[PDB]
């Protein structure tokens, strides 16, 4: 044993990842999705406040990854995507967390791109009437708290459960001793009925609530409300015939209800384009099934089955008289829808297991995607617009597959795996909805932007040995239409345009056990791409970045120290991006050191603390977000990472 502060994830089986996001992590997680990835090479954050960080994969934001929780998808409402899906997840309430780098499985939903990332709670086994709890409090600087509950109860027949959590910061420090408008609370309610009547079947209805707030220095407003509500209902059938091995269905329902305005937490800025209070609504309705069959026999497996998904977009705003003073709240007016999206798909996957050491994948889906713009007008400031593409509709059918190759060899316990891949992807709600511009010649974004088409070489290897476990995965792929944001200055309008791109990179890692006590590890992740239509680097692409961990573990305590070093990215797009961000400058490297620490004090309770970033260095991330005109931010000047940092956490299970 011994515990111990997680610093990294290393790839377990090929191309996939998997960790229990209840364990303590050293650059210390703020309560949200995406910091939840960073621990894991290949992920990258846009930095907005203090959380709720945009993930990006591989150098791919957005959509190109496919997140979901207990396998439904919840979206957010935000035009700029201030909500972005993770920022309703909380890491710490879930059982198991799970990425599929690559368009590698096709079990999970469309035109996952770039990867799959899977949030899952497991059902609960009682065989004995009883019950189980595990909870952990956080402390830290900055006035950081956090509180988890997790506690169960039932019988062989059936269960209860509920899973909560309540946490919150105030603004943090970067390096040079500045304040950052961060600070946000976030808090989560969730729970499980499960019911299962013979050890075949079980049947399970959940249902939870959320909501939160969270300042931001790069934006010109704050969400002010998270509001999350969600329901779904699960079937899980084992061992129906002799090669039908389970069958599962689903049905969920994610509701958000995202709220944004300039003076709740904060007071509006005089000099901007913002002078006055104003809030702006914005909901999403996600409702979505699946279900899918497992055959096995001899050497296969084969998992067939279907899905689909419907989701609805409205909002509405404030107003503003400026003749006299009043303020009427956005809630005083109807809601005006202006976006739903439908999906059905079809998917199967054929494992062979030919003989001991080889396995061949394949896996192929059919989507039909269709999307209405019900936006009767457009905004264009007080003043409004006709909207030209007003209730058209559009439809695609897109395919979408991939082979993996997986060799075990003799001599040493080493997998080497090569996989190719493609992959179709409906544009999302940013990409139609959020541009001013469509392509050069388009009536708007809606009309004209096309799918985007993923074509893809995923390879690597693992070695799980002894004293050393590495592995190492790389990437080629050419994108067909990648659907990219171009930002021009009245003041930023963006133009939403496809374009040819390559991309490439990989990521590899090593944790080496010296002693009985000594444990070191290392990383390195490396994204790259071109915009082969106009000649030129792909924009907000993560720089090349380096860990390494060193960690002693007696009996009963464990301490850490972890090295993190980010080269420069010099190779930059200046005003292309998506609808988050836009590149600007070259960013700077850097360099940031953190300890940890764990303690069991018994087999139920255990300690554990960190520094993060020892020396208060002051930096920034290539892809943090420009800190706000009104926050006293010069142009361009991207979002500070937080100086020197201190937290304690303890951890109980009964
Ligand atoms: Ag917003
Ligand atoms: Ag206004
Ligand atoms: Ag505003």
Redesign the pocket.
Known sequence: LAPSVVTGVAQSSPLTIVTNPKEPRQPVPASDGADYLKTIPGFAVIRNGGSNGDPVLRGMFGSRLNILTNGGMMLGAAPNRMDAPTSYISPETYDKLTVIKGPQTVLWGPGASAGTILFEREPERFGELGSRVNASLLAGSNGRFDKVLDAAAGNRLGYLRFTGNHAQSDDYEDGAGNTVPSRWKKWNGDVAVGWTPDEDTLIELTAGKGDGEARYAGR??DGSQFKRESLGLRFVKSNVSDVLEKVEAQVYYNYADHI???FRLRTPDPSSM?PMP?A?QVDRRTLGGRLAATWRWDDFKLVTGVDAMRNEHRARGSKYDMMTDYYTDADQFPWSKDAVFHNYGAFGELTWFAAERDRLIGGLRLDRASVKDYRQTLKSGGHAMANPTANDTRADTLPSGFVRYEHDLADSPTTLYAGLGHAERFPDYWELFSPKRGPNGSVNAFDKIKPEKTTQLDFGLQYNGDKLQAWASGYVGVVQDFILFSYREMGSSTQATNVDARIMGGELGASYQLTGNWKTDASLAYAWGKNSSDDRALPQIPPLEARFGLTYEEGDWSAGSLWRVVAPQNRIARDQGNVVGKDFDKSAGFGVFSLNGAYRVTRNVKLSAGVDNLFDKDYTEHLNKAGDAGFGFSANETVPEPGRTFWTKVDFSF
């Open positions: 010109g407003m944004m305005d300039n913002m104003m702006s």
